[PDB]
Amino acid sequence: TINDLPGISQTVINKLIEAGYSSLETLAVASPQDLSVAAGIPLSTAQKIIKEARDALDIRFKTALEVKKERMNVKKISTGSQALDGLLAGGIETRTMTEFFGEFGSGKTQLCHQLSVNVQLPPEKGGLSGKAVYIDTEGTFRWERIENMAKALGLDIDNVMNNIYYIRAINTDHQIAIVDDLQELVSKDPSIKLIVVDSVTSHFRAEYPGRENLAVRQQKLNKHLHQLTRLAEVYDIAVIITNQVMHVPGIRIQLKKSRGNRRIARVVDAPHLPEGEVVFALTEEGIRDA
Amino acid sequence: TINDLPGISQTVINKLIEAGYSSLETLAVASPQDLSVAAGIPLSTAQKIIKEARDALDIRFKTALEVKKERMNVKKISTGSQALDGLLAGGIETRTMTEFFGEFGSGKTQLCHQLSVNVQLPPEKGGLSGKAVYIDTEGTFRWERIENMAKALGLDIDNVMNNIYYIRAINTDHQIAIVDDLQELVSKDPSIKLIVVDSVTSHFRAEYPGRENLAVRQQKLNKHLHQLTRLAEVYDIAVIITNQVMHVPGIRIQLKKSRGNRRIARVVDAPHLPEGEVVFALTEEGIRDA
């Protein structure tokens, strides 16, 4: 869980794990001299790691200055829930693939829809003034939902629906291919800033079912995810995937159910993001607060 | 505020609030014959209450010499609105918690940035030459604001944004843990004279739905608010908490809206401070008068 340390070499990371320092919490409670003599690492390097080890575990107060730097440095998309935006240090981020996995109805879909709409807002409103691309794997798209979310944001339905490139991926090959053709699609239309793949694992599970296949599944399935990650990294766009459930980087968020209207959000895998969970709701207007 | 009026039959206190004479300041400046014929209440009694309505907000005439003493004797943070400053008899005090509450847009938030910028100025300019710590609860912070405010006050934008410690509280457990560390922070940096928690109860209301674990939402909130109050009292620091709404808090100022720009402030409670209300405005420069 330490592979994500600010300004750190890969060589040392190894030496760190070798020495026996697996988690960031072991490094945290460590003494510079100790970690230094137990893995080569110059004394200056030993303490830099320890410092950064804490910053992730402990609470530190940045300054409104650094904040301005970051805010205008990278850019994110708002989910519609202030609570969730927080869990996501602002929201869905470009140049990175964020995944929402959770049981059926956990929020996954509505959130994909919400983002295909919110991405069109302006930076002032948690948007990036751009278009989305929804890749309907199991046939989950619902315009009745886009309309309601557009309505809530008092936007031109028609127009909002025209800013969402849509497409059905019926089997893995088509899923693999459509994605292959995203490079071209974005080149032709640079206003695209969001790629959405609902149920990415879906066909891969259907076609290569069982453990008798589990191997080459995650395999072909990881090559797919990389194709997506590379695209988000090269075109500076956000990629969102959903995986339905009861090692490919990017944020992984778990959605869960609470009493009827409410849902729980929790950070699983993610470097720059603070662990902990927050609640939000699924209303008629869409992904919003409780 | 009139319920607690000198020797008065509750039956009449009704006829008053029933005529609309809620606030004491309005009674104080009313006509015994215009009031008598408003709540039927006799002239004898009418007069007897208008006179008692004045002694209430009891006005004291000091010499310009007295006031120049007291103004220095006690350093308060101005708000940009001399009317609001008046309502607060100078400004926000240190070693005390002040609460602004009202509907989204009441000003409570901008008034927070305003303060995070004015605390930096020196006493003569309305500040305390201190630093501010902004605790973002629902993502209300905005740097473009701390900018326009630094601009209007002709400050060094960069240096103003460097004197504000910032941090977002994704949930209650976190909010709570940040305030615990708040103690250690002011020891670390004594230059801090202002703390601001925007929407203290946001997460509490949302994570403790309906009225259930209220056992602790309340137990927890108290220890959380008292905690902040010690902070202020022990470290000669001014503490500010906002609260959005459609027993501890030193001062409680309610804010309300008027025509899209003007906002009303009213002393809902606070020992010293003279009950009554005033009107200010939200400008591109910041919090000013109208």
Author numbering:
A (entry chain B), B (entry chain A): 13 to 258, 279 to 322
Paper text:
Homologous recombination is a ubiquitous mechanism for maintaining genome integrity and also for generating genetic diversity in sexual reproductive organisms. This reaction is catalyzed by RecA family proteins, including bacterial RecA, archaeal RadA, and eukaryal Rad51 and Dmc1. The current model holds that, in the presence of ATP, the recombinases coat a primary single-stranded DNA (ssDNA) to form a nucleoprotein right-handed helical filament, and initiate a search for a secondary homologous stretches of double-stranded DNA (dsNDA). By contrast, archaeal RadA is a better model for eukaryotic recombinases.
First, the basic structural element of these three new helical filaments is a RadA dimer. Moreover, the NTDs are separated a long way from L1 and L2 motifs. We found that the locations of the L1 and L2 motifs in the four left-handed helical filaments are relatively conserved, but in contrast, the NTD locations are quite different. The first hinge region, located between the NTD and the PM, is referred to here as “subunit rotational motif 1 (SRM1)”. Subsequent structural and biochemical analysis revealed that SRM1, a hinge region between the NTD and the PM, is not only responsible for structural flexibility of the NTD but also is important for RadA's function in promoting D-loop formation.
